[PDB]
Scaffold this active site. Structure first.
Site, mmCIF file in Angstrom:
data_model
loop_
_atom_site.group_PDB
_atom_site.id
_atom_site.type_symbol
_atom_site.label_atom_id
_atom_site.label_comp_id
_atom_site.label_asym_id
_atom_site.label_seq_id
_atom_site.Cartn_x
_atom_site.Cartn_y
_atom_site.Cartn_z
ATOM 1 C CG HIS A 87 4.948 -14.556 125.200
ATOM 2 N ND1 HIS A 87 5.634 -14.356 123.796
ATOM 3 C CD2 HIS A 87 3.964 -13.543 125.279
ATOM 4 C CE1 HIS A 87 5.178 -13.138 123.380
ATOM 5 N NE2 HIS A 87 4.214 -12.681 124.172
ATOM 6 C CE1 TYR A 125 5.434 -10.190 120.889
ATOM 7 C CE2 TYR A 125 7.356 -8.894 121.363
ATOM 8 C CZ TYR A 125 6.127 -9.450 121.540
ATOM 9 O OH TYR A 125 5.718 -9.130 122.815
ATOM 10 C CG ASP A 185 9.365 -6.873 125.612
ATOM 11 O OD1 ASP A 185 9.631 -7.318 126.679
ATOM 12 O OD2 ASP A 185 8.381 -7.127 124.934
ATOM 13 C CE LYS A 216 7.611 -10.110 125.918
ATOM 14 N NZ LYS A 216 8.002 -9.825 124.807
HETATM 15 N N1 LIG Z 1 4.161 -10.090 126.755
HETATM 16 C C1 LIG Z 1 2.892 -9.823 126.110
HETATM 17 O O1 LIG Z 1 2.189 -10.808 126.135
HETATM 18 C C2 LIG Z 1 2.898 -8.685 125.274
HETATM 19 C C3 LIG Z 1 1.732 -8.136 124.577
HETATM 20 C C4 LIG Z 1 1.582 -7.164 124.183
HETATM 21 C C5 LIG Z 1 2.703 -6.185 123.936
HETATM 22 N N2 LIG Z 1 3.927 -6.595 124.363
HETATM 23 C C6 LIG Z 1 5.108 -5.683 124.397
HETATM 24 O O2 LIG Z 1 4.758 -4.343 124.832
HETATM 25 C C7 LIG Z 1 5.090 -3.648 123.701
HETATM 26 C C8 LIG Z 1 4.221 -2.347 123.749
HETATM 27 O O3 LIG Z 1 2.900 -2.621 123.464
HETATM 28 P P1 LIG Z 1 2.075 -2.592 122.030
HETATM 29 O O4 LIG Z 1 3.182 -2.934 121.189
HETATM 30 O O5 LIG Z 1 0.946 -3.399 122.127
HETATM 31 O O6 LIG Z 1 1.537 -1.249 121.955
HETATM 32 P P2 LIG Z 1 1.820 0.542 122.623
HETATM 33 O O7 LIG Z 1 3.336 0.559 123.053
HETATM 34 O O8 LIG Z 1 0.882 0.644 123.721
HETATM 35 O O9 LIG Z 1 1.640 1.365 121.470
HETATM 36 C C9 LIG Z 1 2.283 1.273 120.364
HETATM 37 C C10 LIG Z 1 1.721 2.156 119.104
HETATM 38 O O10 LIG Z 1 1.630 3.221 119.603
HETATM 39 C C11 LIG Z 1 2.083 4.236 118.510
HETATM 40 N N3 LIG Z 1 3.179 5.169 119.192
HETATM 41 C C12 LIG Z 1 4.010 5.138 119.806
HETATM 42 N N4 LIG Z 1 4.503 6.178 120.371
HETATM 43 C C13 LIG Z 1 3.764 7.048 120.309
HETATM 44 C C14 LIG Z 1 3.714 8.552 120.659
HETATM 45 N N5 LIG Z 1 4.840 9.142 121.153
HETATM 46 N N6 LIG Z 1 2.696 9.353 119.997
HETATM 47 C C15 LIG Z 1 1.615 8.495 119.374
HETATM 48 N N7 LIG Z 1 1.773 7.144 118.797
HETATM 49 C C16 LIG Z 1 2.857 6.717 119.337
HETATM 50 C C17 LIG Z 1 3.124 3.286 117.611
HETATM 51 O O11 LIG Z 1 3.323 3.757 116.442
HETATM 52 P P3 LIG Z 1 4.690 3.713 115.526
HETATM 53 O O12 LIG Z 1 5.462 2.426 115.752
HETATM 54 O O13 LIG Z 1 4.256 3.768 113.941
HETATM 55 O O14 LIG Z 1 5.424 4.854 115.926
HETATM 56 C C18 LIG Z 1 2.232 2.077 117.609
HETATM 57 O O15 LIG Z 1 1.300 2.128 116.628
HETATM 58 C C19 LIG Z 1 4.869 -4.555 122.448
HETATM 59 O O16 LIG Z 1 5.552 -3.984 121.392
HETATM 60 C C20 LIG Z 1 5.642 -5.804 123.067
HETATM 61 O O17 LIG Z 1 7.139 -5.520 123.035
HETATM 62 C C21 LIG Z 1 3.981 -7.728 125.217
#
Ligand SMILES: NC(=O)c1ccc[n+]([C@@H]2O[C@H](COP(=O)([O-])OP(=O)(O)OC[C@H]3O[C@@H](n4cnc5c(N)ncnc54)[C@H](OP(=O)(O)O)[C@@H]3O)[C@@H](O)[C@H]2O)c1
Ligand SMILES: O=C(O)COc1cc(F)ccc1C(=O)NCc1cccc(C(=O)O)c1
Length: 316
Positions: free
Chosen positions: A111, A49, A44, A78
């Site tokens: 997006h 980004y 994704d 997006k």
């Molecule tokens: N469409 C939209 O508007 C939108 C909005 C938000 C997000 N997104 C997409 O969704 C993806 C995921 O959401 P997100 O980045 O907000 O947050 P998330 O996936 O909920 O959490 C990411 C965080 O969790 C940590 N983490 C990952 N795996 C872990 C594990 N097994 N144990 C402990 N900590 C862990 C990562 O640390 P490290 O990386 O340091 O390992 C990072 O700090 C985004 O990257 C993006 O691609 C889209």
């Protein structure tokens, strides 16, 4: 648990993908390489980004190494808010394709439903601090997305952060050519999204859950915010299954027929997060996790609450 879900364009989408928001450009190439090496087939991405070039380096190297074939990958990006004008959509897609070093995307999403004034700035502001909107209707943006399918740039199109009335607006668009394949929305035990998920699924739209771990690295995190990864109730469910809390948080949306896109740049966690096809949460576990809903959002687009298309005034 099958590894892919069938979309309404006839293609299959892997239910577990790698998120890339906040992945530093100096770490994301290795993160994506590791992810592909350990089984991920869905990445994704987004122009906003600022790391698509570096994601692309990884994808290209794994294609060149013949670790995977292009047809086996499912790459999502997006369209950013400053490119909603019909005349800017193709160029935005092409820039993303160039950066990712691809000749097509598997899925391209609007997006946010909110269009902003075009220009260099991703959040153009007036002198008083408000985001400056675009006058381009989301139905017209949708028509521009449809053209991308017809030109072969993308295999599927969809939406992100659309509320059910906004989804309905597209579904009811005069002359609609392609239905959205996916609505990508925030979803986790503190924002369970029952109503919007049911609505989308009933229309054949697949839902992708973002921030499934509660985005602990979100830039606006406050010390007092709730924390999914530290919730003792979720930890207990994980312990019962001999899994990590993150693994439970990833398995949860999978069992709701959602796609889920946890982000990591840590090799051990990238592998951990993929090891979720070897256990099952009970119905009772699922309902218990659902019970933790508190309508709490990582991503509330707070700078755009006055925008006519701000999505989060509606209940769902
Ligand atoms: N469409 C939209 O508007 C939108 C909005 C938000 C997000 N997104 C997409 O969704 C993806 C995921 O959401 P997100 O980045 O907000 O947050 P998330 O996936 O909920 O959490 C990411 C965080 O969790 C940590 N983490 C990952 N795996 C872990 C594990 N097994 N144990 C402990 N900590 C862990 C990562 O640390 P490290 O990386 O340091 O390992 C990072 O700090 C985004 O990257 C993006 O691609 C889209
Ligand atoms: O879209 C996603 O995955 C997650 O949201 C983003 C991602 C970005 F790369 C860049 C901005 C955002 C975003 O929506 N920021 C909100 C914000 C908060 C404070 C001040 C300015 C903007």
């Amino acid at each position: 648990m099958a590894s892919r879900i069938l979309l309404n364009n006839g293609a299959k989408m892997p239910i577990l993908g790698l998120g890339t928001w906040k992945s530093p450009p100096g770490q994301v190439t290795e993160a994506v390489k590791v992810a592909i090496d350990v089984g991920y087939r869905h990445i994704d991405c987004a122009h906003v980004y600022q790391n698509e070039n570096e994601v692309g380096v990884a994808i290209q190297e794994k294609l060149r190494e013949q670790v995977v074939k292009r047809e086996e990958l499912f790459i999502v990006s997006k369209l950013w808010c400053t490119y909603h004008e019909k005349g800017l959509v193709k160029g935005a897609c092409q820039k993303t394709l160039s950066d990712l070093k691809l000749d097509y995307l598997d899925l391209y999403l609007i997006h946010w439903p909110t269009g902003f004034k075009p220009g260099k700035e991703f959040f153009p502001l007036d002198e008083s601090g408000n985001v400056v909107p675009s006058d381009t209707n989301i139905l017209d943006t949708w028509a521009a997305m449809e053209e991308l399918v017809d030109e072969g740039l993308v295999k599927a199109i969809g939406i992100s952060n659309f509320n059910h009335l906004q989804v309905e607006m597209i579904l009811n668009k005069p002359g609609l050519k392609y239905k959205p394949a996916v609505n990508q929305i925030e979803c986790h035990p503190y924002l369970t999204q029952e109503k919007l998920i049911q609505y989308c699924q009933s229309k054949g739209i697949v839902v992708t859950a973002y921030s499934p771990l509660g985005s602990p690295d979100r830039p606006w995190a406050k010390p007092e915010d709730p924390s999914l990864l530290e919730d003792p109730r979720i930890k207990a469910i994980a312990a019962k299954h001999n899994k990590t809390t993150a693994q439970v948080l990833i398995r949860f949306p999978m069992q709701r027929n959602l796609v889920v896109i946890p982000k990591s740049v840590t090799p051990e966690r990238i592998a951990e997060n993929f090891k979720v096809f070897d256990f099952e949460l009970s119905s009772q576990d699922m309902t218990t996790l659902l019970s933790y809903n508190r309508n709490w959002r990582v991503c509330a687009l707070l700078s755009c609450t006055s925008h006519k298309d701000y999505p989060f005034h509606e209940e769902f």
